[PDB]
C-alpha cells in the first residue's frame, strides 16, 4: 500500500503513466491550487518497490502539463507548457493558446519527433538534437479538435472529436488531404483511443456520454454504445480482454465486452478519498493505482477478475466480427 | 557532503530509533542512542564480524564485496551500509 | 537405522518452506547498473 501525500494534500492528480523501459517505474503529474506550499507544476517519478513518497522530482515554479517520455527508452522527457511552448529535459541529468496533447514519433535513426495539439486544435510538430529543446524547428497543421488519436499501424493518420459535434480524420502528408469526418453517432467527442489488439479498431467518446467503436475500415461506427461518464478518461485494458473503463466521482464503471453484453460489467465507488482522479493499470499485476482530487495516491488488487484466458485471446477477432454483425443487426 | 545528505535523509526517515555513523574504525561520528557504551560494543565488535564477513565473501572468490549488511530482528532493524571510509548503521522499527 | 531421525529431519519442513519463500522474496537486490544516455 503506497498512498503518496508528499506535499500532495492540496493538489489534484492530472495524469498517471508507467514506463516501458522500467516496467516497475511510474510517473505522475498533478496540478495544485494552493501556492503556499513547496513549488508549482508537477512531475513526480517513483518505482513500485521504492518508498511511498516520490523518489525523484523536478523542482521549479513552472506549471507543467502535457507530459510524455522518450519512445525507445526513458532518456529524454518532453513537456508541453501552458503557454504553447514546449520543453525537453535530459533524464540522465540532475502564444495565446495552451497545448492540449503531446506525442513522440519514434524515428530510431535520431531524435524523435514531437507533436503538440494546442487548446484551439491546431497541431504543431518538430524535433531538434540540441535539447536546450529549441522550438525554432516547427511545422503547423490545420487541426480543429483537441485530443488527436493516431493510427497504431500507420502513425501518419489521425482522428479527433470536435466541439462542433463531428469526428474529423486526416493525416500527416497533407493537413487537408482527407478532411471528411467520422459520423458514427455524430456527437461532440472529447476522447479517442485504439483497441490495442489485432484490428484497426479505435474508440471515441463524446460529451453526451456516448462511446463509439471507430473501425478504421468503416465510415459508420460499429457499436454505438452508451453510458454516463463517457466524457471522462477511457482506456483499453492491458489484458487480452477488450475491457473498457470510465471513472469520475470516486466511481469506476468497467466493461468486459469479451464475456458479457455492453452493460457495465463492474462498478466501484471508493471511500478512501472523494472524487477519484487519473488511474493506471499495469499488465504485470492487478495492483491498480489511482489518484484522488485531494492529490493523494492509492492502489487496490482484485485478482479474480484478472483474465478469463479462453474467450478473450483468439476469439477477440471473432468478437469484432460479431460487433460488425451487431451493426448488420442495427440495420 | 553526501555523507551529510545521507545522514540527513536517514534522520528524515521516520521509524529510525538509534542512528550510528561510524568510520571504518570503531568511531561513532554521530549516534541517536540513549547510552554510548552500548553503541561502542557494537560499533567495535560488529566491524570485527564485518571483517569476518568480507573474509568469507571473498573466500568464495573475489567476485563480490560486502555491499550491505541489513539485518531485521523482532524488536528492531539494524541497517548496515559498509562504506569505503564509513559504515552507515541505523536502528529502525522493522516496518 | 534410526527412522525417527529421518522423521525429526522431516520436521524441519515448515521452517524450510518458510525460508524458501523468504529467499524467493529476497532473491534480487536493487540493480542500478551504470548507463550513459548521449551525455551531451
Amino acid at each position: 500500500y503506497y498512498w503518496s501525500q508528499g506535499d500532495q494534500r492540496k493538489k489534484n492528480v492530472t495524469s498517471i503513466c508507467w514506463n516501458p523501459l522500467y516496467p516497475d517505474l511510474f510517473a505522475v503529474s498533478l496540478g495544485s491550487y494552493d501556492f503556499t506550499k513547496q513549488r508549482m507544476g508537477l512531475i513526480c517519478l517513483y518505482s513500485l518497490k521504492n518508498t511511498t513518497h516520490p523518489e525523484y522530482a523536478f523542482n521549479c515554479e513552472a506549471g507543467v502539463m502535457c507530459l510524455d517520455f522518450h519512445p525507445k527508452s526513458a532518456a529524454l522527457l518532453a513537456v508541453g507548457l501552458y503557454d504553447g511552448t514546449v520543453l525537453v529535459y535530459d533524464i540522465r541529468n540532475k502564444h495565446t493558446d495552451p497545448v492540449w496533447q503531446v506525442k513522440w514519433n519514434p524515428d530510431t535513426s535520431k531524435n524523435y519527433n514531437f507533436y503538440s495539439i494546442s487548446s484551439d486544435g491546431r497541431v504543431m510538430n518538430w524535433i531538434l538534437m540540441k535539447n536546450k529543446n529549441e522550438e525554432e524547428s516547427t511545422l503547423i497543421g490545420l487541426a480543429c479538435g483537441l485530443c488527436f488519436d493516431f493510427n497504431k499501424f500507420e502513425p501518419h493518420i489521425f482522428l479527433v472529436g470536435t466541439e462542433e459535434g463531428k469526428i474529423h480524420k486526416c493525416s500527416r502528408a497533407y493537413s487537408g488531404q482527407y478532411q471528411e469526418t467520422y459520423n458514427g453517432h455524430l456527437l461532440a467527442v472529447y476522447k479517442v483511443k485504439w483497441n490495442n489488439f489485432h484490428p484497426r479498431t479505435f474508440i471515441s467518446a463524446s460529451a453526451d456520454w456516448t462511446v463509439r467503436i471507430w473501425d478504421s475500415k468503416y465510415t459508420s461506427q460499429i457499436i454505438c454504445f452508451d453510458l454516463s461518464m463517457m466524457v471522462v478518461d477511457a482506456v483499453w485494458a492491458p489484458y487480452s480482454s477488450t475491457v473498457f473503463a470510465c471513472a469520475t466521482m470516486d466511481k469506476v464503471q468497467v466493461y468486459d465486452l469479451n464475456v458479457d453484453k455492453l452493460n457495465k460489467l463492474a462498478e466501484q465507488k471508493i471511500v478512501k478519498q472523494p472524487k477519484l482522479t487519473n488511474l493506471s493499470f499495469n499488465y504485470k499485476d492487478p495492483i491498480l493505482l489511482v489518484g484522488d482530487s485531494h492529490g493523494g495516491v492509492t492502489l487496490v488488487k482484485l485478482s479474480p477478475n484478472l483474465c478469463k484466458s479462453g474467450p478473450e485471446i483468439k476469439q477477440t477477432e471473432d468478437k469484432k466480427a460479431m460487433e460488425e454483425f451487431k451493426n448488420v443487426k442495427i440495420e | 557532503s553526501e555523507v551529510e545528505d545521507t545522514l540527513n535523509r536517514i534522520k528524515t526517515h521516520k521509524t529510525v530509533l538509534g542512528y550510528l555513523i561510524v568510520n571504518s574504525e570503531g568511531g561513532v561520528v554521530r549516534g541517536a542512542f540513549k547510552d554510548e557504551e552500548e553503541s561502542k560494543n557494537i560499533a567495535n565488535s560488529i566491524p570485527l564480524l564485518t571483517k569476518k564477513a568480507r573474509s568469507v565473501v571473498r573466500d568464495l572468490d573475489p567476485t563480490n564485496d560486502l555491499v550491505f549488511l541489513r539485518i531485521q530482528t523482532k524488536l528492531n532493524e539494524i541497517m548496515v551500509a559498509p562504506d569505503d571510509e564509513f559504515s552507515l548503521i541505523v536502528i529502525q522499527t522493522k516496518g | 537405522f534410526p527412522q525417527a531421525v529421518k522423521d525429526l529431519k522431516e520436521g524441519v519442513e515448515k521452517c524450510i518452506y518458510q525460508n524458501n519463500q523468504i529467499d524467493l522474496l529476497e532473491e534480487y537486490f536493487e540493480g542500478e547498473t551504470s548507463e550513459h544516455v548521449v551525455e551531451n
Binding site: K49, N50, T51 | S1, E2, V3, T6, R9, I10, H13, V67, F68, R70, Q72, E77, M79, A81, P82, D83, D84, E85, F86, L88, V90, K94, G95 | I22, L25, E26, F29, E30, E32
Partner: peptide
C-alpha cells in the same frame, strides 16, 4: 576522491537500505 567514492557507495547503500521486507 575518497569522499566521492564513499558517496558513490553510500548512494546505492541508502537505495537498498530503504527496501526492507514487506508483504
Amino acid at each position: 576522491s575518497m569522499y566521492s567514492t564513499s558517496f558513490k557507495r553510500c548512494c546505492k547503500i541508502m537505495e537498498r537500505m530503504v527496501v526492507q521486507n514487506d508483504q
